[PDB]
Design a protein around this ligand. Structure first.
Ligand SMILES: CC(=O)[C@H]1CC[C@H]2[C@@H]3CCC4=CC(=O)CC[C@]4(C)[C@H]3CC[C@]12C
Length: 166
């Protein structure tokens, strides 16, 4: 919960949606809730229209699996790295902005929602193709956030250690 209008960081230049699909593991995020997933992964599959189906899955402490299915749609025709995502019929879409990705190793995703023009809440996820990233990559991605006035101090490391080999 923050003062002012939503930050509007630059997004990934020359973004190629065709190289984005497949499985991404969650490495770090701004937590959305104080409750509980590990081994967090999302599978993206690119459709005919440029819509992207998203299947998010996580393991809970008791070893059960929680899943949610959603769809990402480009918000506009100018900037292919600015999408919006919807997971439930009853939930308005949320921005899904790809700030940086090399398609083969990492992606930084940002989302911000206003609470009037005077306040906002924002979120960010560092994703990877593998279950871990070099500390210097994580640092470089957090620097993007910081340099755009997005706070990284509340970010948590997702447990990719107590997890199956997939
Ligand atoms: C792991 C991953 O790719 C991240 C990037 C965008 C993330 C989603 C963005 C929307 C979202 C917000 C919530 O309120 C619950 C979790 C979810 C449903 C997120 C789950 C993890 C996702 C899918």
């Amino acid at each position: 919960f923050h003062l002012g209008k939503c930050p509007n960081p630059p997004v990934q230049e020359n973004f190629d949606v065709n190289k984005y699909p497949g499985r991404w593991y969650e490495i770090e995020k701004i937590p959305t809730t104080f409750e509980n997933g590990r081994c967090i992964q999302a599978n993206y599959s690119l459709m005919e229209n440029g819509k992207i189906k998203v299947l998010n899955q996580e393991l809970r402490a008791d070893g059960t699996v929680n899943q949610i299915e959603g769809e990402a749609t480009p918000v506009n025709l100018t900037e292919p790295a600015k999408l919006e995502v919807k997971f439930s019929w009853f939930m308005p879409s949320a921005p899904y902005h790809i700030l940086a990705t090399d398609y083969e190793n990492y992606a930084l995703v940002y989302s911000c929602t206003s609470i009037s023009q005077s306040f906002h809440v924002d979120f960010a996820w560092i994703l990877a193709r593998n279950v871990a990233l070099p500390p210097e990559t994580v640092d470089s991605l957090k620097n993007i956030l910081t340099s755009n006035n997005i706070d990284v101090k509340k970010m948590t490391v997702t447990d990719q250690v107590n997890c199956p080999k997939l």
